Design a protein around this ligand. Structure first.
Ligand code: 0HH
Ligand code: 0HH
Lengths: 208, 208
């Protein structure tokens, strides 16, 4: 079945976890402690020397977005056709771009870079609001009328940014309602309120 | 048909161009000058305010990796099954990770960071050599026995690094032979020797 190997943080595993939970899938969490990691053996066995590591039967995967696309492909959360599949990728690549900046700020220069980052945030979120405005008035999902892996990834992106910059979605009504709507999905809402998610820090350095 | 909108550089369009050329596809190049860009009109119309922009019929796309996956999906260069498709993604995500570091060095701190970057390069390339060593002794492609979009992206990554750090592939027999082998493909070899590729700078700031 499914196994996710990661440090005890939400980080790059939050979106895929939301996906599995919302889709009613079962998986095992293999928690790797900083000590175990510093031992070196696991890290040396990882393709790119990093986590998360994911297992689907004997298929071993690395790279958070590969896991998301794999689950999206296998579970039918990758658009209804090739055109939608491309739009889903366009959304996810954009989500990834901002996540990288978020990650850089959090771990590289939180104190000195936060003000500049928050000032530039609106412009960074505008694209997703626009995407929403062009798809059924933003009443359904980011692409098409069915959920996709990019939805879970974008939702996480938005959630963590509201912790970083409380109220950042006030400027974006479609994104605001989208967060509330997706968060209300029964299995997702239950997962998001579970200690399995809540008692885990967003990042690994105590910043958010 | 196909249209790629970009600045007059190889950058993030090199891989997809190699793909189209090698696959015998025709496309139009719409060159955007720094002046035209600074005007602001085109940039404001771009989803994430950046290039490349890609057009396939009435389908408009942004994000270099979205264009690669779209071409891979529609042209049959995305693995033979879901398992291979995931491995292709894993390779491309890894290629993207290193490309981002390469781009950061080139445009952010070439002079001061080059030495450290080159020292860390072997460890950054090892994963791709390992990937090749696990797929038919590295005698075919990065994943499976058929070419994929990740091949064109990895090939470009390797080509530009050979310019940045001559001989970086010497210690990697599989990657070395792979570059020579893929570069020898008739249509690709012809494209790589054409002025449309050769007379274009790798990057936009005169560094490489
Ligand atoms: C409470 C303790 C928390 C543990 C320490 C903080 C964990 C931070 C998240 S893990 C950070 C890093 N992994 C990555 O950056 C993964 C990026 C990869 N491109 C992906 O998308 O999957 C990694 O493996 N880093 C380890 C390494 O590179 O050695
Ligand atoms: C000799 C002159 C060449 C032009 C000058 C150098 C151009 C550098 C390459 S273009 C750089 C930037 N685009 C990107 O970074 C694209 C990132 C996107 N995630 C992708 O993968 O496609 C961009 O649009 N930047 C423009 C902007 O953000 O306004």
């Amino acid at each position: 079945p499914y196994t996710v190997v990661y440090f005890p943080v939400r980080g790059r595993c939050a979106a895929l976890r939301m996906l599995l939970a919302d889709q009613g899938q079962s998986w095992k969490e293999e928690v790797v402690t900083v000590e175990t990691w510093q031992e070196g053996s696991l890290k040396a066995s990882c393709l790119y020397g990093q986590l998360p590591k994911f297992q689907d039967g004997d298929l071993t995967l690395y790279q958070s977005n590969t896991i998301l696309r794999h689950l999206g492909r296998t579970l039918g959360l990758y658009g209804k056709d090739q055109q939608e599949a491309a739009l889903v990728d366009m959304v996810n690549d954009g989500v990834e771009d901002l996540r990288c900046k978020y990650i850089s700020l959090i771990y590289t220069n939180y104190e000195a870079g936060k003000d500049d980052y928050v000032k530039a945030l609106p412009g960074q979120l505008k694209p997703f609001e626009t995407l929403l405005s062009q798809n059924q008035g933003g009443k359904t999902f980011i692409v098409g009328d069915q959920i996709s892996f990019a939805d879970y990834n974008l939702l996480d992106l938005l959630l963590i940014h509201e912790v970083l910059a409380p109220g950042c979605l006030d400027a974006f009504p479609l994104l605001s309602a989208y967060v509330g709507r997706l968060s209300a999905r029964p299995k997702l809402k239950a997962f998001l309120a579970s200690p399995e998610y809540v008692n885990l820090p967003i990042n690994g350095n105590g910043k958010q």
